[PDB]
Amino acid sequence: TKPIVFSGAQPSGELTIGNYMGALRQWVNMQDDYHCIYCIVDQHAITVRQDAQKLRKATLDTLALYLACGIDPEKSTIFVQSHVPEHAQLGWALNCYTYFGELSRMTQFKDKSARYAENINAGLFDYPVLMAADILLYQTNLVPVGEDQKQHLELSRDIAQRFNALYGEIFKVPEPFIPKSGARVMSLLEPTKKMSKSDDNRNNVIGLLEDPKSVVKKIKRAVTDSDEPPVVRYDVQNKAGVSNLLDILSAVTGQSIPELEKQFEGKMYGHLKGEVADAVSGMLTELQERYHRFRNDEAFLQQVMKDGAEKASAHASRTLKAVYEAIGFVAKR
Amino acid sequence: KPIVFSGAQPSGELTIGNYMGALRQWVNMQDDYHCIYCIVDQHAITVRQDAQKLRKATLDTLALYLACGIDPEKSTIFVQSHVPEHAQLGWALNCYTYFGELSRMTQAENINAGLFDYPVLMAADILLYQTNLVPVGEDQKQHLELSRDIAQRFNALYGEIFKVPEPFIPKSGARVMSLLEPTKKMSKSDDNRNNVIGLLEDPKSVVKKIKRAVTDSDEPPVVRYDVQNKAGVSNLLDILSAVTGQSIPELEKQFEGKMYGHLKGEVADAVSGMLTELQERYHRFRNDEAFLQQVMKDGAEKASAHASRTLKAVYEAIGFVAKRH
Ligand SMILES: Nc1ncnc2c1ncn2[C@@H]1O[C@H](COP(=O)(O)OC(=O)[C@@H](N)Cc2c[nH]c3ccccc23)[C@@H](O)[C@H]1O
Numbered sequence: 001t002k003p004i005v006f007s008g009a010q011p012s013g014e015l016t017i018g019n020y021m022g023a024l025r026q027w028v029n030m031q032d033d034y035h036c037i038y039c040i041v042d043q044h045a046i047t048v049r050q051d052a053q054k055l056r057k058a059t060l061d062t063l064a065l066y067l068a069c070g071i072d073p074e075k076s077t078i079f080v081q082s083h084v085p086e087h088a089q090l091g092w093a094l095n096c097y098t099y100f101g102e103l104s105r106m107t108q109f110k111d112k113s114a115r116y117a118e119n120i121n122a123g124l125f126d127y128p129v130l131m132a133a134d135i136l137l138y139q140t141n142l143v144p145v146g147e148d149q150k151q152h153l154e155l156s157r158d159i160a161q162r163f164n165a166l167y168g169e170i171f172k173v174p175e176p177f178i179p180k181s182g183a184r185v186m187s188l189l190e191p192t193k194k195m196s197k198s199d200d201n202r203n204n205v206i207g208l209l210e211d212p213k214s215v216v217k218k219i220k221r222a223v224t225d226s227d228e229p230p231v232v233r234y235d236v237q238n239k240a241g242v243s244n245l246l247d248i249l250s251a252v253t254g255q256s257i258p259e260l261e262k263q264f265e266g267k268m269y270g271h272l273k274g275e276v277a278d279a280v281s282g283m284l285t286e287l288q289e290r291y292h293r294f295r296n297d298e299a300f301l302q303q304v305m306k307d308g309a310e311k312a313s314a315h316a317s318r319t320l321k322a323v324y325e326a327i328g329f330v331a332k333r
Numbered sequence: 334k335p336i337v338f339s340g341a342q343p344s345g346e347l348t349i350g351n352y353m354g355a356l357r358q359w360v361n362m363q364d365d366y367h368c369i370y371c372i373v374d375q376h377a378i379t380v381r382q383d384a385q386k387l388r389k390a391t392l393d394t395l396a397l398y399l400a401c402g403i404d405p406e407k408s409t410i411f412v413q414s415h416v417p418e419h420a421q422l423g424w425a426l427n428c429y430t431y432f433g434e435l436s437r438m439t440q441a442e443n444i445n446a447g448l449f450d451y452p453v454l455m456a457a458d459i460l461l462y463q464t465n466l467v468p469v470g471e472d473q474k475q476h477l478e479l480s481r482d483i484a485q486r487f488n489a490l491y492g493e494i495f496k497v498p499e500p501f502i503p504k505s506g507a508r509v510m511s512l513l514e515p516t517k518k519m520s521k522s523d524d525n526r527n528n529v530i531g532l533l534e535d536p537k538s539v540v541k542k543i544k545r546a547v548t549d550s551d552e553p554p555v556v557r558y559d560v561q562n563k564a565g566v567s568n569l570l571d572i573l574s575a576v577t578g579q580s581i582p583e584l585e586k587q588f589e590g591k592m593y594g595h596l597k598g599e600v601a602d603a604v605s606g607m608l609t610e611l612q613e614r615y616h617r618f619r620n621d622e623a624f625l626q627q628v629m630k631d632g633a634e635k636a637s638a639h640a641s642r643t644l645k646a647v648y649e650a651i652g653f654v655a656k657r658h
């Protein structure tokens with residue numbers, strides 16, 4: 001059997017080009033090479049307060065977006081996290097093998113606590129343990145994610161190793177698959193801050209479902225630097241905005257930064273931004289064209305969810321059975 | 334019938350205080366209330382434990398509750414981990430529980446997240462079954478209050494999804510104090526086991542512990558009820574009264590001109606009389622694996638039917654896409 005790939009994305013906000021480059025791009029390319037399982041993590045989404053209609057709609061939007069990107073339900077298992085109870089079950093169990101200090105030290109918890117001070121909830125704190133349960137359920141070998149998830153992934157490995165050391169070979173110890181370029185796409189008006197699907201300032205973000213024209217305007221307005229003459233060179237410290245543009249272009253086209261630097265020799269930021277806008281306006285038009293075909297077909301979306309949850313539960317129940325046996329629960333018969 | 338929820342720890346080493354106090358009280362109210370008994374194995378693992386002993390303890394607890402008179406045809410008794418809805422609701426309620434509320438629970442960075450987060454699981458345990466009443470001790474009053482606050486908070490956002498649970502106020506009335514410390518209650522959590530009489534102790538063990546029990550230096554020795562001045566003797570009277578149903582004034586008359594030796598002898602004989610009938614039932618149930626499996630299956634099946642209905646409403650309110658069956 002093939003090694004197993006697992007990853008997920010929250011149905012909250014509107015997925016950005018950041019989410020595509022750091023994760024979904026890789027998800028599509030891994031489908032034949034590995035046994036791939038992709039999840040819409042609605043249980044993680046509710047750690048941030050959403051309107052009920054928006055949550056339901058965003059779950060289906062996200063599903064249709066996976067499909068529009070090229071995630072093929074004939075190759076990959078595609079499911080909604082809440083449809084498989086084993087995530088919640090293993091998540092509770094793994095709380096007992098996770099230290100408080102490991103969760104309080106998390107960057108994401110700290111960033112999210114500052115952003116949502118009126119709702120610093122227990123789910124936001126316990127976030128990484130459920131995420132570990134998501135991965136560990138499927139005997140996952142590889143986890144394609146953006147750089148912002150490295151810390152969460154490190155904890156999952158620690159939990160797997162710690163549990164295995166007491167009980168035997170129950171889990172696989174997963175490995176991150178973070179891409180060389182586009183692992184952490186930055187904000188267009190604030191290139192020192194990660195591009196967030198929940199920025200109020202829309203201008204920071206390139207939406208996967210935002211109007212391309214509005215997106216082309218966003219690239220042209222992206223902040224660069226005061227260098228005289230302007231030079232297209234990679235330097236995240238002194239040229240954050242230009243570097244982010246080079247990183248985006250590299251990730252979309254598959255060309256290296258040193259290659260792109262040679263390509264823009266004697267050129268300035270107008271050329272860079274023309275070429276970035278071109279490459280991105282292109283992906284989105286195509287992507288949004290596949291999207292509606294999927295998104296307006298409720299019977300097909302219902303079928304993908306049904307089939308995917310079936311496949312997922314078969315794997316997850318198998319692992320949870322072994323976990324429950326090992327910790328000492330009386331088996332349900 | 335109001336719905337009553339109790340969580341039973343699979344590790345508790347139950348005493349005659351537990352039995353003649355709350356347990357016997359509740360055995361005689363299984364037709365008055367819709368009683369739920371949940372053996373809380375997911376709570377147990379917040380303390381690291383030997384796996385095989387936890388499995389054994391789950392079944393020991395089930396058999397002991399059955400032996401004490403919990404009737405699986407009247408009440409619902411089941412193992413927590415057999416009903417996935419507990420963990421499911423637990424996670425959802427984490428998202429409507431403040432971090433501060435958990436930090437302020439009467440608790441540095443080396444405690445496991447389960448020990449930190451279990452009050453939310455407790456809330457889920459109760460709220461799943463539309464629980465009206467929860468019989469708690471003083472030590473779990475804070476947890477009940479949190480579950481009431483979570484229920485009201487969720488209902489204010491989404492409509493009346495949960496019942497707001499109430500404490501069960503009336504106490505059993507059977508008083509049972511520690512043998513070497515008559516001022517303190519006999520507790521299943523006592524490190525000093527000479528203070529307690531476990532429900533599975535044999536007649537020789539009970540004799541030894543009752544013989545050792547503290548009594549005053551009154552001269553002449555007198556068997557009279559007086560908690561302030563004769564705590565130990567009064568405890569022995571209360572235990573004997575609880576066992577036989579004879580009133581304190583009846584026992585005071587029964588022991589007129591008798592020393593503390595004769596009282597201790599009668600207390601030991603009385604308690605062991607009670608424990609022998611209970612132990613016969615326990616071992617009969619406990620050694621019948623097929624009967625225990627059937628009780629767990631039926632109970633989980635009953636619990637799940639109810640729990641799934643609540644969780645479906647919870648899931649609909651939050652806005653999750655409904656599962657495709
Ligand atoms: N500006 C950016 N540049 C590049 N990559 C980015 C950018 N912003 C986000 N990402 C990546 O996109 C994925 C989805 O984002 P989420 O916020 O839903 O990502 C999250 O919140 C996860 N915890 C969801 C999750 C839950 N359980 C899991 C198990 C395995 C893997 C992932 C998960 C992520 O991989 C994230 O790293």
Ligand SMILES: COc1ccc(N)cc1
Pocket residue numbers: 087088089090091092095126130419420421422423424427450451453454455457
């Ligand atoms: C009681 O809170 C929890 C927390 C996490 C999970 N997965 C289940 C229940």
